[PDB]
Amino acid sequence: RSITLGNSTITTQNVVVGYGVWPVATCRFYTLESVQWMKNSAGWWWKLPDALSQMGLFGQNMQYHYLGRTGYTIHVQCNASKFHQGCLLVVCVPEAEMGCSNLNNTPEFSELSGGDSARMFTDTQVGESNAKKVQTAVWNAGMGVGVGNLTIFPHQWINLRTNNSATLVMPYINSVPMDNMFRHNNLTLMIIPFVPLNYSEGSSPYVPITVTIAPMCAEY
Amino acid sequence: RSITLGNSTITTQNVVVGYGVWPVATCRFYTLESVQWMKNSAGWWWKLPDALSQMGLFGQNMQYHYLGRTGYTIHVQCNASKFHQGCLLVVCVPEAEMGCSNLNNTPEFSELSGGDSARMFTDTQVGESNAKKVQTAVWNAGMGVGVGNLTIFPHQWINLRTNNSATLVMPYINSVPMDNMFRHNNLTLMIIPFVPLNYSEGSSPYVPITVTIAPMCAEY
Amino acid sequence: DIQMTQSPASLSVSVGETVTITCRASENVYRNLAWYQQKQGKSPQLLVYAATNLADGVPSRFSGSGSGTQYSLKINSLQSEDFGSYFCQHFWSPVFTFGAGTKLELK
């Protein structure tokens, strides 16, 4: 409990590590701002080494030294009373090559990754003739893939009845051992609600979700 | 010869150390831009931990951490042919409390220290009723002091007949062991020409003078 | 092109009944519908997006249903402020079109 890194401190009390493999002034707990899980929410995703590079002094290291090699640990926790209910799905997929709305085009950069701001899913299709937009129908998970099969990646269940938090540890997964961090996002974090949030009247109408990221062994 | 620090390299071939006492990404050879010693020149001075704080990433350390403790080494060399002549005087005085032109006032900050730009002396008096100006008559050395007695401080002679360069090593000289670097300049470098520069026609009409500063053991 | 037909034109019911309103498209929209309400001399506001998902500040009295081309909205109990206009809008593809616009006298 109450681990420390640099000048930040997060308190805790399970863990799931990578594919069985265990992975200096930047090693601090960067914490993105929280999203609000409502009743009829859809899902969120962040591209991983882009949401950091816009903001912190880790991003100040990014413009100086482009090419690097990193390893991540990810804390995800949401806080609610006993009286709510629902079930999330935290999965850290590598090399998420999403598909465009229009069939002949490719999605542009501004839709592909909100820098430290969560892009959202939806539960319908999208129109195609407009511009470069990501095909963001949730029940094919954006990749043309059946969503129920997504647990082949390192995943972790959050079930509001018993469990409350989630921790992920992801080692460096790439073909070439050194690449530029501007044109290649190796990891992708997803949060999908399967059993939707429900509550009776008088409770709070939303459950906030915080995600806390920390790099480990960042070389350049 | 050819010492290295960080990513800078200065070549050399005597040394004079302090008062007998020998004194991390900032340890680089900062090099101020050169002055031009002419025939009828007067003299120059730099306030020491101000000429660095405006410019380098050492100055980026200054705005973050104010209070520090440093130790200096100073390389001074001028380059000329055999056919010139003259004699300089390199002295690193501590706590140079100069006096104003006007008698009731104090000199302002902008005249007291050019940030990495050499303030110059003169060989006359200055008027007094104007503004806050430093009494910069050279033959009292600005401090109301006889100039020929200035070699009580750690000094070094440059004589263009035989010698060519000069190296100074100055340890940390202060009363309190830790002070802010914005309102207190502990050291002051002076260069005064005694025997003025002379040459025959056909030679170059000026001798450039370069000064190269490097800190040692900078704490905060 | 894609068109929206709002039906009926206008209603005049009392306060507190279960009233309904529909609007039909021309082709499939895949539930990409948004309902709007504007009173006299102000900006419109969003109540239901994606034809069933209600907004944040809207009460639970409003509900919308439908799939494909036939879509509808339901107000189970009107109040004093529940008059004003009502507009439905698709957002499938540019060009986005709107509905006609209904009105409530609340007699």
Place this chain on the structure above:
Amino acid sequence: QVQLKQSGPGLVQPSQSLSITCTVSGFSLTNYGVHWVRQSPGKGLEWLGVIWRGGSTDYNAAFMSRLSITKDNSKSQVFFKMNSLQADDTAIYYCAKGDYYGYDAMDSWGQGTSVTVSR
């Protein structure tokens, strides 16, 4: 959070050009796209055009040549130039933000600027 505001001419000359500057607040421009929607008493509501959050633009079919919508990121202002300003443009004009939780729907709007064309 304060929403967006706008300012227009209010009165023009017929067969001219127009410029409304809509000022946003609270949100960035890399996450939301603004919508230009004309509320009219005669034709009703109608949508003109959208610049997306990536800078690419869209327009209505019947207004292909007389519009030019653009924005700035840092100054956080959007500009669009209605052109040729004919007698059927007597309508109030709205600035409105989009992308309500990623759905392409108008979340909040401006205050509305009423314009007329004639003397």
Place this chain on the structure above:
Amino acid sequence: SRSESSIENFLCRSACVYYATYTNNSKKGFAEWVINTRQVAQLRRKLELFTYLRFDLELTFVITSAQQPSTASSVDAPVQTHQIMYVPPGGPVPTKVKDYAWQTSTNPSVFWTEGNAPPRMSIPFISIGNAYSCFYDGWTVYGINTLNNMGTLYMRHVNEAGQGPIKSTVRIYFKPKHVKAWVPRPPRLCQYEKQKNVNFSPIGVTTSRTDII
């Protein structure tokens, strides 16, 4: 039993991945094929189960010919030879049948007369990287990853039209060997739309039944 379900017996197969024709006298008749696994849809699903593959490559070519309708005068021609050129990534590229790039040096080529065994050849794993990438989220244009380019192929006749033209077909086969895979993936559910990318149309999960029970 498990030895059928290993990685090697899951991939050491063959497929008619390409099928083109060319004649001898059109002066633009020469086949051209870029090597990429995403050509045939059926093989594409089995290779997109993983993410990073590392395998050398083995090719065979079956080649047949056919006589075109000539004029007259009892046309007879001897046996034909075909030239199959391989170009590594970053080499010259031919534009015509008579061109400079066939008589170049570092483009390895074979020759094969008709009426013998088909001309098998084998290409080792050529990459600056350590493994191929069947998926790539990023730019080099989005989702390209130019390091996993394997080169092209070109085929032409090495004869001249004597009295009547002959067109000919060619079926490039394909057989990976010594495969090591990494970091698996869920199988692709939707259809395939474009050969270059992963674009798709959204579809339901399974087919439905009438009710729950």
Place this chain on the structure above:
Amino acid sequence: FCGSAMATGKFLLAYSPPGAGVPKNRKDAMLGTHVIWDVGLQSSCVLCVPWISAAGYVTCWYQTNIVVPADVQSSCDILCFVSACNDFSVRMLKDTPFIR
């Protein structure tokens, strides 16, 4: 946190060092040295900072809203305590200014 027993939430406790400016956002305070505080796990967090005779700020920020079950009141209060961590060092006594 002397609030309810069911309600949770999260808070930042950002200390800004002297010389550095006061943070004027939620985000920038996370860049400086700080501690995220949970409410549901522990009910009292501890923070140490040196003090010596602008010159520093200790401001606090909403990490999230306060989620609370129904039939519980929403507004909760927070106390704040002060003690010397280690020994001080005083010198040259004088009289107090808290008299007429």
